């Protein structure tokens, strides 16, 4: 803790002698023009001092050391090392101050994309989106990052990751009352899952959500939509989702609050309802 | 107007107009007393009478709840409204039979 | 008669679970089968790289 | 009351199975990509080191 | 957007740069003889341009550049990287032009196997068959590719993948092809699962499928086959499917179409169909005369 | 009644057997994954150090 | 047992993702290394 | 068809070229002292020829070529590549004629244990034991190989891996009229999994087997063993295994053969048994 802090001070001295190496580059490298390996080992000692700071729990200092090492190392060579240093700096910045982590991760995104490795690019896009969501309140940037990551994943035929990202995007859009995109995504994911034998059980839930979203926009067209879903999937009426939706819509034909209240309480009597469904029902049934 | 123009479904602005069974339109679009044909599909065509109300936005034809239920119209949808002329010697109404019942139980 | 309906529901759900595990078995078996092959490949890779690098570095360093 | 418990826990187990299935499918998707990456690196290192050793002679 | 337009513009610029660079590389080798650095640098530029172009949402020219770079690299006695680039170009063309992607994938298959790897070639065969069947209306080529993949997997004693390929081939054959191959494959897979660790209770479905396939030939063969299955597998004797088969056979024996219809309806109500037994049942019922 | 008892008992027993089998099986995959993780770390460290030392030696020669 | 599955497989998923990241890192690093080494040999 | 014929023809041509290569290379080494690159070229040609032989669906000759390359390479003062060649030759010989496959895999095991790796040695041991079991009737060699593999796995702290080998050894020992080793392994594995949240569910089953294999001697010892196991596993009485064992004991005590057989039949009806359990129960019913 404190002796490790003494060695962290020694690492600050290591950064000071790295500045001495920069002074060498400035003045003495004229006679040491061939000392490129000297710059390489300067970057190495930079990284070691940054690791020492990381052990010292000096997150800001470790991140600054990582950023300096990344900037010095990206001398138009060893691009992957610079990108790795930038993502390490972002990870160090994940806690404490993550704002600059966003910019560093964007630079790493640009570099990795320049290489063309779409998997890591989409992974970092999801990372920045989730840190945005859990730290900042802006959602439009998060939804754009989710869209870009899902497109990248779908480009390489990675259907599952793109489908889950699009499901989250549809849920967020429904929260932001953009129901056309939500219903489109839910229908697409349901029809895709139903096609394979391994993903036929989940379909019901998706349909439910889609139906609800549709029932939010047009009440009359809700009957046509539910009939279309029923005929598309003969085994959709049996499940409790279709029965409950039918009960709700047939009760809404007459202005009787008691019916829908009892129905929702009974459905909740068998399992707890999440925040999304509870809020959606409360908002929609108000009128 | 004569040939037909695209218009947007709207809610009836006032209950009093909802009692007139008239497709309420803005003053800038048509004149009161005109009869127009609402088109939603090649087979589904209906005819309404136009009444002018200040609150109606131009380019939208307001329909009361009974009209929406009868025509299956959705607010905010697109329809094609054209001017409809009644042959007074052939289309004039001589005798009606209608079904009337309490609106609210 | 309601007991008949609930037991029919139980039959449907239980058959669904049985078929679900029936599916699960082959998938996990294939996962393990791929795991063993990747293990073999990585062990061979590390072994060859280590020996080749050691031998060639020793040969090229002691010739001077 | 036992029947209701059966229903609730059966549906809970079903949902758990479905989500486990989705996650397992994701892992299976990743496995092939990691395997192909391993094969590519293996071939690259083998050819590179063999060519370098041949040139050394 | 600025990103796509700039990416396409720089892709055109670097493609022109690479073309002039290969021409100047020919000129250099004829004038200075600097070695092979020029051609390798041109190939690297081509690869960079191709990857950034496939980022740029336009795929056709990206795959074309990948193929050209792979060809130029194979021109220099290098196959591994050429084969990997062929695979990448085929993946890119998967969404652009099926025929060119298929050509690249088969080239990659042959070069990779010639190197000495089969499982990767088996995966490529499976992918080729899948891309054939999904978008193109053809089966025979898919059947042959799946058979080759199964053969390669069994050569490397990969029992699971080979069995899956054989089962898929048998199902496809039973759908259209004759029953003998399907009968034999289904019987083999059913008998090769009597002592599986996790699938000790799985062969019954395969035996049921084989019994149905036998029933599509003749009544005598059907009853003989079900009797042989009964004698061979005691557990199949206590199977609901065995009772269903016996009921259906007895109903068909007296030419009581009502009995067959009610039996199949009760089976459907008890157990949901699978979209594959229904067609066979309909075909059998059509010949009730 | 009797039929319900029989069907439920048999299917539950089959499910229990399958579940215990897969629980036992997961451990081998876990251990194999751990071993490959260790091997990958060894490979990465060794190759990185070897390449850096070789580059340093090449610079010294030149 | 289902819950124990879920948690165990979740841990496996996390660590498989980590090892995949590492293997791709190694692949790219060795590719760049061989490129640089061949260029250096060409210089000689 | 045509592909196989072409591959076989060009592989015969490659074998002719390879024998020419080895002969002329030794001649040139004698007359010029060119070094050892030609031997490496010959080894690579042999490896490619063996691969092409494997393509032609000729596994015996492919394995012969692989073994020739392995021996030449180990003569070139390098074992591990020769080890890979030997393992590939054994894999090729798995089908057709595996007699030499066993010897070549044993040589691979020898070189690996000389190097030191344990897990690959254990894998080769279990593979050889499985080959003996499936293709040969002599179970003594298989038992020895399985015991050695189990010992190696246990030494490497791989309890899970060693458990499977120990269970197989116990089963085969019980098959060959040997119960002491089987009894010891069964009780040891049952005790081992006592405190594991996962394997505890299995703890009962093995114990039951032990009890059944402890009844092959006498009655009083069986009662003592079952009551001791119940004392160590109080929950054991919850299952039906204890009830079935007690029913068997009481029925055999009074020479009630018919009730014993009926109980066994009904137990089979509720849940079917395997060949091992069925034959064991039949042997028990012999007296």
UniProtKB/Swiss-Prot annotation, chain B:
It comes from Cricetulus griseus. Required for vesicle-mediated transport. Catalyzes the fusion of transport vesicles within the Golgi cisternae. Is also required for transport from the endoplasmic reticulum to the Golgi stack. Seems to function as a fusion protein required for the delivery of cargo proteins to all compartments of the Golgi stack independent of vesicle origin. Interaction with AMPAR subunit GRIA2 leads to influence GRIA2 membrane cycling. It is found in: Cytoplasm. Homohexamer. Interacts with GABARAP and GABARAPL2. Interacts with GRIA2. Interacts with PLK2, leading to disrupt the interaction with GRIA2. Interacts with MUSK; may regulate MUSK endocytosis and activity. Interacts with CDK16. The gene is NSF. Belongs to the AAA ATPase family. This is Vesicle-fusing ATPase. The chain holds residues 1 to 104 of 744 of the full protein. It comes from the Eukaryota. Disulfide bonds: none annotated.
UniProtKB/Swiss-Prot annotation, chain E:
The keyword Lipoprotein does not apply. The modification Phosphoserine is found at residues 27, 30, 196. GO terms for biological process: apical protein localization; brain development; intracellular protein transport; membrane fusion; neuron differentiation; positive regulation of ATP-dependent activity; protein-containing complex disassembly; regulation of synaptic vesicle priming. SUPFAM superfamilies: TPR-like. The modification N-acetylmethionine is found at residue 2. GO terms for cellular component: glutamatergic synapse; neuromuscular junction; postsynapse; presynapse; presynaptic active zone membrane; synaptobrevin 2-SNAP-25-syntaxin-1a complex; terminal bouton. It is a peripheral membrane protein. GO terms for molecular function: protein-containing complex binding; SNARE binding; soluble NSF attachment protein activity; syntaxin binding. Its main location: membrane. Keywords: Acetylation, Cell membrane, ER-Golgi transport, Membrane, Phosphoprotein, Protein transport, Transport. The keyword Zinc does not apply. It is found in: Cell membrane. PANTHER family: ALPHA-SOLUBLE NSF ATTACHMENT PROTEIN (PTHR13768:SF23), SOLUBLE NSF ATTACHMENT PROTEIN SNAP (PTHR13768). Belongs to the SNAP family. Required for vesicular transport between the endoplasmic reticulum and the Golgi apparatus. Together with GNA12 promotes CDH5 localization to plasma membrane. This is Alpha-soluble NSF attachment protein. The lineage of its organism: Eukaryota, Metazoa, Chordata, Craniata, Vertebrata.
Curated annotation (Swiss-Prot), chain F:
It comes from the Eukaryota. One of its GO terms (biological process) is positive regulation of hormone secretion. Its main location: cytoplasm. A lipid is attached at residue 61 (S-palmitoyl cysteine). It is found in: Cytoplasm, Perinuclear region; Cell membrane; Synapse, Synaptosome; Photoreceptor inner segment. Residues 1-57 form the t-SNARE coiled-coil homology domain. Keywords: Cell membrane, Coiled coil, Cytoplasm, Lipoprotein, Membrane, Palmitate, Phosphoprotein, Repeat, Synapse, Synaptosome. GO terms for molecular function: calcium-dependent protein binding; lipid binding; myosin binding; protein domain specific binding; SNAP receptor activity; SNARE binding; syntaxin-1 binding; transmembrane transporter binding. Palmitoylated. Residues 1-51 are annotated as: Interaction with CENPF. GO terms for cellular component: actin cytoskeleton; axon; axonal growth cone; BLOC-1 complex; cell cortex; cytoplasm; cytoskeleton; endosome. Part of the SNARE core complex containing SNAP25, VAMP2 and STX1A;this complex constitutes the basic catalytic machinery of the complex neurotransmitter release apparatus. Recruited to the SNARE complex following binding of the SNARE complex component STX1A to STXBP1. This complex binds CPLX1. Found in a complex containing SYT1, SV2B and syntaxin-1. Found in a ternary complex with STX1A and VAMP8. Interacts with HSC70 and with SYT9, forming a complex with DNAJC5. The interaction with SYT9 is inhibited in presence of calcium. Isoform 1 and isoform 2 interact with BLOC1S6. Interacts with CENPF. Belongs to the SNAP-25 family. It comes from Rattus norvegicus. The gene is Snap25.
From Swiss-Prot, chain G:
Expressed predominantly in cerebral cortex, hippocampus, cerebellum, adrenal medulla and retina with weak expression detected in non-neuronal tissues. It is found in: Cytoplasmic vesicle, Secretory vesicle, Synaptic vesicle membrane; Cell membrane; Synapse, Synaptosome. Residues 1-40 form the t-SNARE coiled-coil homology domain. Plays an essential role in hormone and neurotransmitter calcium-dependent exocytosis and endocytosis. Part of the SNARE (Soluble NSF Attachment Receptor) complex composed of SNAP25, STX1A and VAMP2 which mediates the fusion of synaptic vesicles with the presynaptic plasma membrane. STX1A and SNAP25 are localized on the plasma membrane while VAMP2 resides in synaptic vesicles. The pairing of the three SNAREs from the N-terminal SNARE motifs to the C-terminal anchors leads to the formation of the SNARE complex, which brings membranes into close proximity and results in final fusion. It comes from the Eukaryota. There is a cross-link at residues 38-39, 42 (Glycyl lysine isopeptide (Lys-Gly) (interchain with G-Cter in SUMO)). Belongs to the syntaxin family. This is Syntaxin-1A. Phosphorylated by CK2. The record marks 39-40 as: (Microbial infection) Cleavage.
